[PDB]
Amino acid sequence: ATKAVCVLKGDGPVQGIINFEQKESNGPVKVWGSIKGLTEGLHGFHVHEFGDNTAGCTSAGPHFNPLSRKHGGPKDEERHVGDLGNVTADKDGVADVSIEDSVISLSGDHCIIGRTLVVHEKADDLGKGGNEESTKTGNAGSRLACGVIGIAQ
Amino acid sequence: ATKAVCVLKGDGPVQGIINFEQKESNGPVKVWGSIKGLTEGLHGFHVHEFGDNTAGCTSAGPHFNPLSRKHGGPKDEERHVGDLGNVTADKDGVADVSIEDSVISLSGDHCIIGRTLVVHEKADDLGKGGNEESTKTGNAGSRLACGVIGIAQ
Ligand SMILES: [Cu+2]
Ligand SMILES: [Cu+2]
Ligand SMILES: [Zn+2]
Ligand SMILES: [Zn+2]
């Protein structure tokens, strides 16, 4: 299996560790871990194009979108490669993450290694919010925490 | 990738931003930027295997060494891919890094994106110290700061 890892940090209390595993180069990527310091409820969760933390999360750029598509949710056909939807934080502020995705990869053209994982202030509306921003970003508000996705042992 | 970037951070005061540029895939990588808070003099500067900051710089693993060679200086044939030698900090504790290297790459087998850049406590002896540790790490000592190398624009 190829494996990756990401430590998420920001200016506030949001922090976590997200693991990635892909047994086969043409198979799905398992994504799992935990993020703490979040408000209860849904938080947008995306891979952004650049692994540039020189301005914190602000320098990561837009959603990783090598097929030049509109923003959606992970199970939509029309989505950015970087669109991993929402994580859910419980009343203790902890979001336990467990996702499988077959659009991101840990190798080849949809490789997310060296890009930035971001957790957001608000819910991602999955591109169904009915305004231009919905189809760009999903209206997920500010970037609370982020990190560069690295190769793991 | 034709560009990459890395933000260096540690437990102490060492911090900086290192840029990578490779205009041709068959070509040298330019490495440059500024690291501050270093003691005056020579500091080991390596790419380590894993982009894993889960236990600080310790979890980055050993030097990136896909050809299973011994440790050397960047001018040696016998070197780890990750062996970029030393950087020099001035009397104000600033290293204005400027390196060109043709063994590291921003694509292919020697790709360093998703791995960890590390700046060290001590001088790298470049494999010339006469002990077993010289042939593994160059006797560069502890990991003062590090960061995951990310794709930039
Ligand atoms: Cu986002
Ligand atoms: Cu090192
Ligand atoms: Zn998107
Ligand atoms: Zn080495």
Author numbering:
A (entry chain A), B (entry chain F): 1 to 153
Which sentences did the original study use to describe this structure?
Cytosolic copper-zinc superoxide dismutase (SOD) catalyses the dismutation of the superoxide radical to oxygen and hydrogen peroxide via redox cycling of the copper atom, playing a vital role in the cellular defenses against oxidative stress. The enzyme is a 32 kD homodimer with each subunit forming an eight-stranded Greek key β-barrel containing a disulphide bond, a solvent exposed catalytic copper atom and a buried zinc atom that is important for structural integrity. Copper and zinc atoms are linked by a bridging histidine residue, which is detached from the copper during catalysis and reduction to Cu(I). A positively charged channel and ‘electrostatic loop’ guide superoxide and other small anionic substrates to the active site copper atom.
To obtain the carbonate adduct crystals of copper-reconstituted wild-type human SOD were soaked in potassium bicarbonate solution. In the bicarbonate-soaked structure, a carbonate ion was found to be present in each of the ten different copper sites in the asymmetric unit. The asymmetric unit of the 2.15 Å resolution structure contained five SOD dimers (labeled A–F, B–G, C–H, D–I, E–J) that showed differences in the structure and oxidation state of their active sites. In four of these dimers, one subunit contained Cu(II) while the other contained Cu(I), characterised in the latter by the absence of bound water, the discontinuous electron density indicating breakage of the Cu-His63 bond, and the elongation of the Cu-Zn distance. In the fifth dimer (C–H), in contrast to the other four, both active sites were oxidised. In subunits containing Cu(II), the carbonate anion occupied a position ∼5 Å from the metal, lying between the side chains of Arg143 and Thr137, and it is held in place by interactions with the Arg143 side chain and water molecules. The entry of carbonate into the copper site in subunits containing Cu(I) is accommodated by a conformational rearrangement of the electrostatic loop residues 132–140, resulting in an opening up of the channel entrance by ∼1 Å. The coordination geometry of the copper has changed from trigonal planar to tetrahedral, with an oxygen atom of carbonate acting as the fourth ligand, coordinating directly to the Cu atom at ∼2.0–2.6 Å, with a Cu – Ocarbonate – Ccarbonate angle between 130° and 150°. The protonated His63NE2 atom is pointed towards an oxygen atom of carbonate (the separation between them is 2.5–2.9 Å for the four reduced dimers), suggesting that His63 plays a significant role in enhancing the affinity of the trigonal planar Cu(I) for this axial ligand. The carbonate ion is further anchored to the polypeptide through two hydrogen bonds between the nitrogen atoms of the side chain of the catalytically important Arg143 and second oxygen of the oxyanion.
